[PDB]
Amino acid sequence: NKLNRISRQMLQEMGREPTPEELAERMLMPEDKIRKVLKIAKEPISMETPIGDDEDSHLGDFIEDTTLELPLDSATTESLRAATHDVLAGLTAREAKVLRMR
Amino acid sequence: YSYTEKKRIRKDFGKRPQVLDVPYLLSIQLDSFQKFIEQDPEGQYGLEAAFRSVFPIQSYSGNSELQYVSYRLGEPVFDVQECQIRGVTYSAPLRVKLRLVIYEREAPEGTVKDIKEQEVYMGEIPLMTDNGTFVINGTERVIVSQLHRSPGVFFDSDKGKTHSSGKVLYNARIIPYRGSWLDFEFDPKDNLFVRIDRRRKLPATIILRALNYTTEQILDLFFEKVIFEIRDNKLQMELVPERLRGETASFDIEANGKVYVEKGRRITARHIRQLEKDDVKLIEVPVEYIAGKVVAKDYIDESTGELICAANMELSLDLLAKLSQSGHKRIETLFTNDLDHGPYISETLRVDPTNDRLSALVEIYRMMRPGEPPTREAAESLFENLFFSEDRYDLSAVGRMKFNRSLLREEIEGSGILSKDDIIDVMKKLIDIRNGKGEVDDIDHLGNRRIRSVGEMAENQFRVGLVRVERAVKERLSLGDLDTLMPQDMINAKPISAAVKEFFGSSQLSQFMVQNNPLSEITHKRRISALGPGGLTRERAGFEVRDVHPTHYGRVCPIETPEGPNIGLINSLSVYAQTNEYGFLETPYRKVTDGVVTDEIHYLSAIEEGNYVIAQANSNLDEEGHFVEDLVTCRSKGESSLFSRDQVDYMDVSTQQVVSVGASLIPFLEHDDANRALMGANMQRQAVPTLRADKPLVGTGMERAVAVDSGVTAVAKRGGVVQYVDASRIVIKVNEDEMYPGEAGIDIYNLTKYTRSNQNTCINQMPCVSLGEPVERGDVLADGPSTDLGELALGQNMRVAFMPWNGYNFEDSILVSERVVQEDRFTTIHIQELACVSRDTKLGPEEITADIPNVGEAALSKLDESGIVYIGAEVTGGDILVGKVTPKGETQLTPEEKLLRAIFGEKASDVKDSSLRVPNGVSGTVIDVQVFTRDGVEKDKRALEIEEMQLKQAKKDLSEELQILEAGLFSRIRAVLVAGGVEAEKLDKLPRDRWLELGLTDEEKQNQLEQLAEQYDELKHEFEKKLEAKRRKITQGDDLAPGVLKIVKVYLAVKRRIQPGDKMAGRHGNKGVISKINPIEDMPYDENGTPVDIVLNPLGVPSRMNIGQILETHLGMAAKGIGDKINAMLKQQQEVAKLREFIQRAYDLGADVRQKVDLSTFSDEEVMRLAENLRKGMPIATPVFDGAKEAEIKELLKLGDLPTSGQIRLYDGRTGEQFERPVTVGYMYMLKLNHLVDDKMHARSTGSYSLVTQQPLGGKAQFGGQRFGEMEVWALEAYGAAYTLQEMLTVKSDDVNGRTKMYKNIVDGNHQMEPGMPESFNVLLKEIRSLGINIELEDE
Amino acid sequence: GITKASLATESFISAASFQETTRVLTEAAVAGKRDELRGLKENVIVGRLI
Amino acid sequence: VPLDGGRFATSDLNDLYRRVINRNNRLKRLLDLAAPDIIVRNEKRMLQEAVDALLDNGRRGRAITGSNKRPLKSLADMIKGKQGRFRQNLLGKRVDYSGRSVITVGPYLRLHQCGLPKKMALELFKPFIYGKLELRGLATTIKAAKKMVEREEAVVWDILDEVIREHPVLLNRAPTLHRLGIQAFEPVLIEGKAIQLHPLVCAAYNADFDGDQMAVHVPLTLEAQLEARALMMSTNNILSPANGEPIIVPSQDVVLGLYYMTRDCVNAKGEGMVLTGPKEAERLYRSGLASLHARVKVRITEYEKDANGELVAKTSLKDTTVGRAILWMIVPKGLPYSIVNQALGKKAISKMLNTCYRILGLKPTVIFADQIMYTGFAYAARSGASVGIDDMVIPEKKHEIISEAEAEVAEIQEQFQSGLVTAGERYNKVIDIWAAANDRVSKAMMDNLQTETVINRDGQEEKQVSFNSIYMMADSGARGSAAQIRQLAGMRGLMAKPDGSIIETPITANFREGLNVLQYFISTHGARKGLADTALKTANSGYLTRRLVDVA
């Protein structure tokens, strides 16, 4: 709340509006925390916010899954076992046991 | 004839002389905004007008008033170029002087103290470019002019369909400029209704009560009075001898001692004549006729003081007695006629629940706000605020004007609100139409269609800003302390600033300027839209408004409109059209007095033109300009017919004025079907500029006007001689007549160099003049993209042959010789902006460092120490533009990966590779790099180098200005010193700086030398301040978004040529997609051996009736003929005589054209340069409807030495044998639209996925798969393909398990699917189950 | 009529597609109606063989 | 889920769910505080409203999401939509293994295949390429394979031709209407980014080349490959399921080729001579000895299977031309020479294909169709057909006809000023004579245009059907029709004002002449209402098929 208020006098006083470090001096605190405070303060945007074209295209339709695993990798995972399991039968029974162990 | 015309002159066919030349094509855009922001010392539209409405603002009754003084626009923060690079909006600060007055308590008014607060800043409003575009964030945007329904009253029909009883209805609608709508409408029972806005229907009379009108005055207003006298006993009556028309006699009717008519004889012209001339005022009547008649006023019994009858009640034979015995002599009744005067208003009162003013006011307030209790102050106040409040209601000037005009009033200007007189007059007029007297207007007429535009529209938004701040301003002045707070602490910026920003930023009328092409620009800035706010919608209307209207003549182009969902909802402005003074559309016309055609032009609006008889653009007059024929084709009122010699009041200005800038550029348009012409002018705007600006060989003559009027070219500010010519800049030394006395000067044009367009095309200027060449003011200095020597070249004309070629042209497909791609002529240059952002994540900040996990030196080759690609490194797909790395710690890898790192001994980094890399397949040369940095983060090495470089280049740039400027100024001092004390050889020896001392003998030359001193020192000082700001602007830390530490924007210039798949079209609506690129060997050649560039399929010609494209071909060939011919006499070096003779012959052509020509031109240097420009071809101008004719075309082909048929024999380059039949070969101007195949082409195997629904979604630009629809499903359902369909909607898209299980099988070599259940449907189960529904999958 | 006859469909999942969804689900949810699939529209929805 | 710049984004349900929770929880508190009835009652109503807003918002007041005017979307709106479910509504789910680009011709293609851009096929078969690459051991593992195609080593191209060979791809155009809107093709590798599409199919797709784009789909599972080949393959549908007539009928360029090919003039090189068979007929033509159209008897061998499933042979001297003789080389076995002995317009050339199918079966019909196209394009290219401005012949009698009809209106006009005829009667009268005039001009230029070529063979004179360029197109069935031609040479029509009341002063000019200002302006309405009507008729059609497929 204090921040909105400060931007007010300084809004017309500075003629455009105070710089990110301006209200920082106006405020008691470390003043770089302004940035940190400013992030969490934003309210989340409706994932249903209709974007462009109005075509029921909605913001949420554009949010990709980053936790997924592309198959071109999962495929190489199924392979990497077959790779390493083979090279470990190519070694002595104890080296495979010792390496599978370490 | 001008200087850039001496270089090349276009042979102009056509007869009709141009009386007026095309004005500035950007007039509308520029004039409008110019009226908005300006100091207008009166109520004319502008920031001034919107201020004076809501001002002055007083607190609530507290007698604390705040008034408004004046405003000013501060200097722009960045100029247009600077504003574009950084991303800011091009804007100026609005500084407004405010005066706060306080009345003493309690006072006869006077001020304790008044603080005049100087210019409080509210918002920065964007500014319009010299070309009429806006820059919102580093991006050019155009605001389309709007066409809406004009404010006023309008009476409509809504015939036919209503109630399916026929009968039509008649409704009036008052549409004010601001405030609620007032609607009046009838019903099948002829009861008048009213609804405010679209709200509940209400009986009309309730407003009269709300206007404080009791029933008696309602009866007294709309109806006449039938006076009844009881004289002796039982009922005499007053008679207007005319009232008996259209009705039959009710009793024995006799007066003036002579019985004129008995009972049962209808009243014709006979009966009325007798009464009028015999002056029959009073007759004796029976007591039964009033059984139906409604009493006018109230009549009470004098004795009992009790009400005998209320107003508007039907009398009976018995009722007459009770008011007769009360001593009533007079009983007033209504005049009712079912043809002339309908008993409509009367029947509405019986449906009126109200009685008095408050009742009506309550019933209105409860209509508007139902559910809430009415209040005396609420009902009274609300009604007073709707149409009677200066704040919440305005019709403005036009509303009042059209209002007054449609009501047949005298005053064209009046109150900006409604008066009791105003509403009532409309009601009277609406009834008159229902009575058969008067007619209804129609919405589609362009006299009722008003055109707004940027200046006006932005003004409305600024008003909204002031009202949403108004509520705030009163609120603070309530509690204000005496002289502590001031007219700053109250007024904020953001409320006003966010209003205007919300408009320029995302309103439907503000769009990216479709800028691949000057024609595209100029046709965007002249555009109308009936869409957006205050307009109709695609879904609402309705083919009448979409259709072309008779009033569109000379105002709106009939043929340039989109062919999509909104047809006729956009249009384009005509060529000569202008916005009327009041805001309508008026067009030029020529005043024809008596039988002579005068050259005074007269601009007539849609309604003005109505009454006049207007002649035709094509008509033959001569000598004094008498119409040759005794009768001429003309249009007078909505229709066209033959008109007499002296009838015509006016005549068309030009043969062109019906069309638009787009359509006026199509040659032989008169020969093209309207569909293909539309399509032609629609596609002509998509033509990407080419590598070599060519010129149209076949043309109209607008191309000069389009090039200059669009800012793409560089036009001379003042005339003079070119001092210096570089590919960078141009310095003109002004002629003395054009030069200002002070400062001397030279006008320096800084050319735009290679840079990105909105469509990712290349916009680059080239100098068209040579060292030391005379140029006069208004001469073309430099071509822009797609402009040649002052003309408009949207593509390159080329040799074309019509013939099926082995199916390679099958439908519209085009077969192009390799000569074209080798000549690199249709090659096009694209400039792409790629960005790399270093953000901040909860795990840590992202680094732009050149240290990237798991990459070799070949990657790092193209990178400097800092991680940014060098300028000029040509790059291809996959190359690293900007090294970027994001923190990810403690990966938690797996056993076999852990073994992998152990064996190959790589230290797996705590950092992940985010670097910006070239998209797959796009390849180009890096022409620029930008680094924006947050204020406070240390600029890395490269970023500092750049900033230092930009600084040196800036210093060099400013100094170059000063050096040439100083010489130009000192060069004037030298000449004035020579006028009275010339020492020529003596003067230029000593240092030039030591000149300012020498004075002169008494004369103005002493004050002139005096003058140049003053202006010199300012230059010394203005330069200094200019340098400093520039330096500061570089060093100032650039502002970024929240979370972004730094941004690297890389600019690639890709050069794409032509390949199968590009879309190409001529101006005639013939599309095409290049099919094969053929060797010159297989190209058809003529006997002389010259191959043909393009082979078109003739089959496209007959079906689509674009016939202009053929003439254009034929004539095109002829033009090329004169070139080859000239190319021979010049390669012969015959001499000026032989050459001059032949060129003169060409420009005449057979008789009766309008071109004129030489030999006035200096016979050697001026003539010879022109011939060099014609050897490629001789440019020809076919005016739109005045264009050339076959004979002239055929005649020009005779001079060409080329056949009249326009066809020759052609030989296949393969078999070498002839072609049976002659084939048409010629030169067609052809455009490359930007539908380029390596834009369109997309393919995806396995990409990213949407999270919410697991579905293919492009995140890397490896695009989500093609969208598979319902109709496409049916196609599979009609086929037996079950497995194709299952795999389509399960494993190929939605099955998050099955997809991976599938992929592994594809590489294993097993084509199967283990489908499972789609996640979309699997979600549907939870959504149903998330409600109270138990949905199960039964059985087994 | 064609549009009226398509209204009546045994499968409610099919009806929920092209009809008014709210009304279909409610009117079906009360009766405890059991969709046996068997039709085309529904099998496409659940993603099995037509 | 988070976004860039550290901001967050969330579904509207949270705001709704949160509310129901708060209120629910507050109510739980208000029970233990024993609040008065008036409050807990109010709290219950508020909770009731809140749950309702969660389930289906809009059956009450329509609560709006926080700080945003737009109402927050509830669970019923997640299922609901336009129309019914979004899931199954068009569109309809995005699908992997697909692509698209601008399409072009490729007449060299056989009817069962299509040109596929090199890069498109690379990115599409990416998993297959990986598997085939590691099947032969050219790549150690899938990862190395990924790097190979990403490196685009030259060696992969031969491997792609293997994985491509027998593997159909599905091609689709934008308004898929009937089942032929999707057809399976065999891939042919093409340098370049454009899709090449067999010309004969352009009719079934309604695919012009004006820049239309087509989408490609790869049939992954074995069952999908065999569905595409045995059902959706191009060659398996040559006949419309709507009506049994072939939809692969050669389109325009090809039929002008065959029309110009089998046609005959009166006197041309090779007139009257005789040849052993079509082989030496082409030998006559190709060498420049005989004209494509000249009357000639040649020995032909036709076939008739009129036995019991068995082919009879018959040889005779048929009276024909050189072109028809040459063309006979393509016609397989049991078709009679009668089918090719005619002029071969677009109408006959389809019924040719129909009969070939209904007699010899599918396989002979497919390869037949191919041959017809190849020869059609080829000979059409030889023909050197073109269109000049002098190819459109205006009747010599036009100006005279207009004047006579111009005299009639002035007759009827004199009758209206003198009251001999009523105003309404006037409008209809004038409209009829102008209409009648149009027919006159149309049927003048049609006669002149059609036969006026008047030529001589050895004897005196004679006249045949014109060889004029524009006529051949319309007669053959290639393009254009007497109606459209009438607008080029003869006067074009009487346009109609927006009102629909056809104007009593028609368009007296045509496209070969110029149209003046008024005529064009009046022409505009017909075009725009045409585009609007069609663009709307587009919408009417779609809804209709919808209602239809829903009921069936």
Ligand SMILES: [Mg+2]
């Ligand atoms: Mg087509």
Ligand SMILES: [Mg+2]
């Ligand atoms: Mg198309």
